[model samples]
Target: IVGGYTCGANTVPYQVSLNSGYHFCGGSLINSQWVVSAAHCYKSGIQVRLGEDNINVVEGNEQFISASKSIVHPSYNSNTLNNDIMLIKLKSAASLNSRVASISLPTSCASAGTQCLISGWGNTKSSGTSYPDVLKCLKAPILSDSSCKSAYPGQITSNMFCAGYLEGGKDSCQGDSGGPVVCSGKLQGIVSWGSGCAQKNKPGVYTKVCNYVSWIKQTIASN
Candidate 1:
C-alpha cells in the first residue's frame, strides 16, 4: 500500500497473502474454508496464506493452504472492472486461533465518507519495482458515487466504488489487488483497480463487496 505503515502481527488477522509462487495479491479470510479476493487477481496455482503478517518469513501461526477451487464472479467484466470479486475454497479448513480469524461482511453498503482501512503487501510507490515484505495499511475515506463517477467518468458502476484522497499520496497499489477494505469492522470493499498508484484526484476504485453479499452467501452454500 502506498503511503502506509508497516502493520503489526495479527493486527488484521483476516488479511491474507494470495501467492502464485510468490505473493501477488491480498485476500481476506471470510470463513474457515473460504477466502475472498478480486477476480482480476485470479490465476492458476494460487495458494492462500492466512495469519501472515510478514511475507518474507513463515511463522508457526501461519497456515499455508492450497486452493481446491477458485470461483470468480460470473458477470465479472474485465474491460470496466465490474464485479471484480472471487472466492477461493481452501483444500482444508483453516485452523482458527487468535492469530487467524475471519472478517465479518457488511450487511449493507458503507455510506459515503465512511472511513475505511486497507491492508496489503503492495508497492510503496507507483514506479517501484518491488513489493513490501511486510504488510502495510492506510486509511481511506469512502467517496460518493457521484464523485467517483466524475473521477472515472463512465467507468464507475454500481458494482464498483471509490475510496482514497483526491490529493493523492495514499492508496492500494500494484500487488495489493483483492485486499480487504474494512469499515466499522466489516468488510465493505475489495481492492480492485486504480489509475496509477496514489495519483491526484484518482482515488482507488474497489469492488463493492456489500453488493455481492447475497451472491457470496449463495456461492458458499452451494459449494
Candidate 2:
C-alpha cells in the first residue's frame, strides 16, 4: 500500500491495487459480488489481492476484478470523517478458489473487548515507511464502547469503533484504511482513523460494521 501519510513496514497483510497504479488497504471477501473496504480508500481505480502470506517477498497471483461502483456512506465527511465505510461491487463474483474466500459480515458487534484481526499491506510502525508489496496482519483487542468513547475525547461515536494496543507499536497506518477488523469469523469494523499509527495512548479507529447493516443490505440488494 502506498500514498497518503507515511506507513511502516510489515504491518499490512493484503494489498489492493488499482488500475491507476495506486494501491490501497482492503479486507477479505464478504460475498461473491462484494469486498469490504474503507470509503477513504476509494480512488479512480481499484483492485484487491488476497491469500498472500508475506507482503514484501513474493508478489503472489492477484485476483483481478473491476470495481463496478463505489458506495461510501452518504454522511461521510472528510473533515470529521463521519461514516468512513464503503462497499465495492466487483464486476464479477469472486470464484472461491483456494486463494479467495468470503468473510461474513457481523449482524451484531456489541461485544466489547473481543479479540480481532486487522490485515493490510500498509505501514508497520508508527508514521514509518511502507512495506512495498509485502502484506502484514496483526492481532488486537476491541475496546469497549464506553472505553472507546472515553479514549477519544469527543470523536468516538456509536458508528465508530476502537481497536489496537493502547501501549503502542501496533495499529493501522496509511493505506490500511478500508480493511476489515475480523473477529470470530465475522467482520466487526472497517479501518478508519486514529491519533497516530501504533503510538502510545492512541488506538486505531474503525467504522462500526454493525451500525451500517441496513445500508449495506439495501445497497447490496439494489445492486
Candidate 3:
C-alpha cells in the first residue's frame, strides 16, 4: 500500500497474505473456506496466509492454508487484463474471530466518491522493494467511470474501477495486487493494476467485485 498507515491488529481482519515461498501479494478472505483475489496473482503452487498482520513475524494469529483448488475467471482477458478475478478454495476452513474473519461481498457497486479502505503487506511507495512488514491501510476515495476511463484511456472496463487520489500520493502499489478494496463493510474490489503506483492522475485500478457475486456464491456451492 502506498502512502498508507500501519494498522493495528485486527483492524483488517479479512486481509490475507498471498504467498509462494514468501509474501508475493495480498488477498481477502471472503468466507471460511474461500478467498477472492486477482487472477493475475495466480500461480500453480500459491498459498494464502490468514490472520496475518505483520508478514515477517508469526505471532500465532496466522493460519497457513494451501489451496484445495484455485479457479481463475474463465473469460479473463489477458490482452486488456479484464475479468482479473480468482477464487481459491482453502484446504480447510478458517476459524473466525476478532483476529480473523470473512468479509461479505458487496450487493451493489460502490459509486464515485465512496470512501474505501485498502490494505496490504506490500510496497509503501510506487517503486522499488519497499515492502512493509506490518500491514498498511489506505483510505482511497472511489473515482467515477468517466474520470477513470480518461485516466487510463481504453484500459478501464466494466469489471474494473479506479480509486485513490488523482494527483498522486495515495494508492495501492506493487506487491499489493489482489489486495482488498472494501467499502461499507463489504469487499468491493481487488487491487489489479495501475499506470504507476501513486502517480499523477493514475488512481489504482481494481477488479470490481460486484460483477462476480453470483459467480462467487455458485462456485463455492458447486465446488
Maximum-lDDT candidate: 1
Q: Write the per-residue lDDT of candidate 2 for residues 28-98, one digit (tens) a residue.
A: 46777887777777676766544454444454545678888888778988876778877888888766655
Q: Which candidate order results from sorting by lDDT in descending order?
A: 1, 3, 2
Report lDDT (Cα) of residue 186, candidate 3. Answer: 94
Between which residue pairs do clashes occur in model 1? none
Clashes of 2: 16
Tens digit per residue, CA lDDT, model 1, 1-223: 9899888888999999999889989999999999999999999899899989888897667899999999999999888888999999999999988989999999878999999999999989866666788889999899999989999987998998899999988989988999999999999999999899999989999999999999999999999
RMSD of each: 0.9, 4.4, 0.9
Per-model tally of clashing residue pairs: 0, 16, 0
lDDT of each: 0.92, 0.70, 0.90
lDDT of 3 at 52: 85
Q: Regarding lDDT, does 1 or 2 come out ahead?
A: 1
Using all chains and alpha carbons, the TM-scores for the candidates as numbered come to 0.98, 0.85, 0.97
- Which residue runs does candidate 1 get wrong by more than 4 Å? none
Q: lDDT tens string, model 3, 1-223? A: 8888998887899999988989998889998999999998898887789888778888888999898899999898867879999998899899889888999998988889999999898788776668788889999989999999999997888999999999898889888899899999999999999987898998899999999999999988999
By lDDT, the better pick of 2 and 3 is 3
